[PDB]
Design an enzyme around this catalytic site. Structure first.
Site, mmCIF file in Angstrom:
data_model
loop_
_atom_site.group_PDB
_atom_site.id
_atom_site.type_symbol
_atom_site.label_atom_id
_atom_site.label_comp_id
_atom_site.label_asym_id
_atom_site.label_seq_id
_atom_site.Cartn_x
_atom_site.Cartn_y
_atom_site.Cartn_z
ATOM 1 N N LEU A 15 0.814 -1.212 0.000
ATOM 2 C CA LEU A 15 0.000 0.000 0.000
ATOM 3 C C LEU A 15 0.845 1.257 0.000
ATOM 4 O O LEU A 15 0.467 2.244 -0.636
ATOM 5 C CB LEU A 15 -0.942 0.033 1.204
ATOM 6 C CG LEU A 15 -1.988 -1.077 1.287
ATOM 7 C CD1 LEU A 15 -2.673 -1.098 2.637
ATOM 8 C CD2 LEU A 15 -3.028 -0.929 0.156
ATOM 9 N N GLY A 16 1.971 1.239 0.697
ATOM 10 C CA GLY A 16 2.776 2.429 0.839
ATOM 11 C C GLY A 16 4.112 2.121 1.469
ATOM 12 O O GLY A 16 4.294 1.092 2.130
ATOM 13 N N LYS A 17 5.045 3.051 1.262
ATOM 14 C CA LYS A 17 6.440 2.947 1.665
ATOM 15 C C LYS A 17 6.817 4.278 2.293
ATOM 16 O O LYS A 17 6.540 5.325 1.704
ATOM 17 C CB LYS A 17 7.319 2.681 0.434
ATOM 18 C CG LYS A 17 8.222 1.478 0.508
ATOM 19 C CD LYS A 17 8.994 1.316 -0.800
ATOM 20 C CE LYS A 17 10.502 1.182 -0.564
ATOM 21 N NZ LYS A 17 11.240 2.477 -0.491
ATOM 22 N N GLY A 18 7.452 4.261 3.465
ATOM 23 C CA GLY A 18 7.812 5.527 4.071
ATOM 24 C C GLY A 18 9.024 5.666 4.963
ATOM 25 O O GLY A 18 10.177 5.517 4.541
ATOM 26 N N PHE A 20 11.253 4.479 6.839
ATOM 27 C CA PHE A 20 11.946 3.229 7.144
ATOM 28 C C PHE A 20 10.957 2.077 7.281
ATOM 29 O O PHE A 20 11.317 0.996 7.771
ATOM 30 C CB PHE A 20 12.838 3.332 8.393
ATOM 31 C CG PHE A 20 13.694 4.577 8.419
ATOM 32 C CD1 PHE A 20 14.690 4.776 7.461
ATOM 33 C CD2 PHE A 20 13.518 5.540 9.406
ATOM 34 C CE1 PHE A 20 15.475 5.923 7.473
ATOM 35 C CE2 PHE A 20 14.305 6.686 9.431
ATOM 36 C CZ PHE A 20 15.282 6.880 8.461
ATOM 37 N N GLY A 21 9.701 2.284 6.866
ATOM 38 C CA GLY A 21 8.679 1.275 6.991
ATOM 39 C C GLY A 21 7.920 1.086 5.687
ATOM 40 O O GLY A 21 8.108 1.801 4.697
ATOM 41 N N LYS A 42 2.159 -3.347 8.861
ATOM 42 C CA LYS A 42 3.307 -2.460 8.770
ATOM 43 C C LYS A 42 4.557 -3.207 9.216
ATOM 44 O O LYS A 42 4.546 -3.892 10.247
ATOM 45 C CB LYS A 42 3.113 -1.207 9.620
ATOM 46 C CG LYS A 42 4.246 -0.220 9.476
ATOM 47 C CD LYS A 42 4.015 1.043 10.288
ATOM 48 C CE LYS A 42 5.050 2.070 9.976
ATOM 49 N NZ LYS A 42 4.750 3.358 10.671
ATOM 50 N N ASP A 136 4.166 14.173 12.259
ATOM 51 C CA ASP A 136 4.169 13.861 10.833
ATOM 52 C C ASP A 136 2.802 14.077 10.173
ATOM 53 O O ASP A 136 2.584 13.611 9.049
ATOM 54 C CB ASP A 136 4.585 12.397 10.651
ATOM 55 C CG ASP A 136 5.083 12.090 9.269
ATOM 56 O OD1 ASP A 136 5.623 12.996 8.595
ATOM 57 O OD2 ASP A 136 4.922 10.929 8.868
HETATM 58 C C1 LIG Z 1 -2.763 1.515 8.368
HETATM 59 C C2 LIG Z 1 -3.505 1.521 7.030
HETATM 60 C C3 LIG Z 1 -4.780 1.042 6.905
HETATM 61 N N1 LIG Z 1 -5.352 1.042 5.697
HETATM 62 C C4 LIG Z 1 -4.741 1.541 4.660
HETATM 63 N N2 LIG Z 1 -5.465 1.538 3.420
HETATM 64 C C5 LIG Z 1 -5.034 1.905 2.062
HETATM 65 C C6 LIG Z 1 -5.818 1.470 0.995
HETATM 66 C C7 LIG Z 1 -5.466 1.783 -0.311
HETATM 67 C C8 LIG Z 1 -4.347 2.569 -0.546
HETATM 68 C C9 LIG Z 1 -3.871 2.924 -1.975
HETATM 69 C C10 LIG Z 1 -3.057 1.963 -2.778
HETATM 70 C C11 LIG Z 1 -3.175 2.219 -4.287
HETATM 71 N N3 LIG Z 1 -3.900 3.385 -4.583
HETATM 72 C C12 LIG Z 1 -3.951 3.563 -5.784
HETATM 73 C C13 LIG Z 1 -5.196 3.250 -4.056
HETATM 74 C C14 LIG Z 1 -5.223 3.185 -2.519
HETATM 75 C C15 LIG Z 1 -3.587 2.990 0.515
HETATM 76 F F1 LIG Z 1 -2.482 3.743 0.270
HETATM 77 C C16 LIG Z 1 -3.919 2.679 1.828
HETATM 78 N N4 LIG Z 1 -3.529 2.026 4.755
HETATM 79 C C17 LIG Z 1 -2.899 2.012 5.898
HETATM 80 N N5 LIG Z 1 -1.552 2.538 6.038
HETATM 81 C C18 LIG Z 1 -0.874 3.292 5.005
HETATM 82 C C19 LIG Z 1 -0.873 2.783 3.729
HETATM 83 C C20 LIG Z 1 -0.246 3.441 2.687
HETATM 84 C C21 LIG Z 1 0.407 4.630 2.936
HETATM 85 C C22 LIG Z 1 0.432 5.139 4.239
HETATM 86 C C23 LIG Z 1 -0.200 4.486 5.300
HETATM 87 N N6 LIG Z 1 1.212 6.393 4.198
HETATM 88 S S1 LIG Z 1 2.097 6.898 5.544
HETATM 89 O O1 LIG Z 1 1.236 6.830 6.712
HETATM 90 O O2 LIG Z 1 2.465 8.305 5.383
HETATM 91 C C24 LIG Z 1 3.621 5.909 5.749
HETATM 92 C C25 LIG Z 1 4.519 6.058 4.536
HETATM 93 C C26 LIG Z 1 3.315 4.425 5.940
HETATM 94 C C27 LIG Z 1 4.370 6.510 6.919
HETATM 95 C C28 LIG Z 1 1.453 6.791 2.829
HETATM 96 C C29 LIG Z 1 1.185 5.572 2.004
#
Ligand SMILES: Cc1cnc(Nc2ccc(C3CCN(C)CC3)c(F)c2)nc1Nc1ccc2c(c1)N(S(=O)(=O)C(C)(C)C)CC2
Length: 291
Positions: A15-18, A20-21, A42, A136
């Site tokens: 879902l995401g990269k940040g 160090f996680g 995570k 943050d």
């Molecule tokens: C705990 C949690 C619960 N559910 C979700 N759902 C969810 C659903 C869909 C998407 C996208 C994927 C594709 N696109 C196209 C459509 C939807 C999504 F990104 C998240 N994500 C969570 N955390 C979470 C995820 C991703 C990110 C996070 C945090 N950050 S962050 O916190 O800054 C950081 C970097 C971790 C420090 C920035 C990126």
């Protein structure tokens, strides 16, 4: 029942990269009959000892929070001996408010933005009653559960205040999201409830730009100090810009009272910034007037 066995976590996607996680969408399916629930996992991207202790503190912080606008802790997973510790959280299906807002900007009006804003304030105020500093806050960390509910969704930089001080001094190694940081965080590495309020003002700006591309805080601030700077010079100039009362502009279509909330959050004088309770009160009054 807050202990997940690693063998039952089925990877679905990243879902995401940040910080160090990394966060992944997985299915917890211990019965192996494809009836388990989808969760967010995570993990650390490179598990040093310092990053592990930070991660354990972040886990303890999230486990201590229970609020409608804070993502729900579900448990941990460490069937790989000591290391490969993983934090299990609820999965929110609409992703981050940054993506959601950008994708639905033509059908989310200002009353809806103010609903989101008010929920963010209530979440941040609850953090403050626990003497937690988020550090943050940004629309990328705010997650969308449904069209009527958002939650603060990540706590990787959150610190607890010392019992005898109202700030926390910290200089993390790496790239810092300086375009969301209060001036005293850039100059003195001081983080407090008041610098969280500064950053909340940036979040409010973000919302009212609908994540328009050229209108992001990095883009606007680099335009204001000149794109000719590089390296540490950037920070230096940003500091000067903020100390001469340089500020992000009013977003297109933002009413003057909303921009005034922003400008009041961006006070150089740390003690003159509003409280989150007052922010919620003002936002709720405006939202009621709009109805
Ligand atoms: C705990 C949690 C619960 N559910 C979700 N759902 C969810 C659903 C869909 C998407 C996208 C994927 C594709 N696109 C196209 C459509 C939807 C999504 F990104 C998240 N994500 C969570 N955390 C979470 C995820 C991703 C990110 C996070 C945090 N950050 S962050 O916190 O800054 C950081 C970097 C971790 C420090 C920035 C990126």
């Amino acid at each position: 029942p807050t202990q997940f066995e690693e063998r039952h976590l089925k990877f679905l996607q990243q879902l995401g990269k940040g910080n160090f996680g990394s966060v992944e969408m997985c299915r917890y399916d211990p019965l192996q009959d494809n009836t388990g629930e989808v969760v967010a996992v995570k993990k650390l991207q490179h598990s040093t000892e310092e990053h592990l202790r930070d991660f354990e503190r972040e886990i303890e912080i999230l486990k201590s929070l229970q609020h409608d606008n804070i993502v729900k802790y579900k448990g941990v997973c460490y069937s790989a001996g000591r290391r490969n510790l993983k934090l299990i959280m609820e999965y929110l299906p609409y992703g981050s408010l940054r993506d959601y807002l950008q994708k639905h900007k033509e059908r989310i009006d200002h009353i809806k933005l103010l609903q989101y804003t008010s929920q963010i304030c209530k979440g941040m105020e609850y953090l403050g009653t626990k003497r937690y500093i988020h550090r943050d806050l940004a629309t990328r960390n705010i997650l969308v559960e449904n069209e009527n509910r958002v939650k603060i969704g990540d706590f990787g930089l959150t610190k607890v205040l010392p019992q005898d001080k109202e700030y926390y001094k910290v200089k993390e190694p790496g790239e810092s999201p300086i375009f969301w940081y209060a001036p005293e965080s850039l100059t003195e590495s001081k983080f407090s409830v008041a610098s969280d309020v500064w950053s909340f003002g940036v979040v409010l700006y973000e919302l009212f730009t609908y994540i328009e591309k050229s209108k992001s805080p990095p883009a606007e601030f680099m335009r204001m100090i000149g794109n000719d700077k590089q390296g540490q010079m950037i920070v230096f100039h940003l500091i000067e810009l903020l100390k001469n009362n340089g500020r992000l502009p009013r977003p297109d279509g933002c009413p003057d009272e909303i921009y005034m909330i922003m400008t009041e959050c961006w006070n150089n004088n740390v003690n003159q910034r509003p409280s989150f309770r007052d922010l919620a009160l003002r936002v709720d009054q405006i939202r009621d007037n709009m109805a």
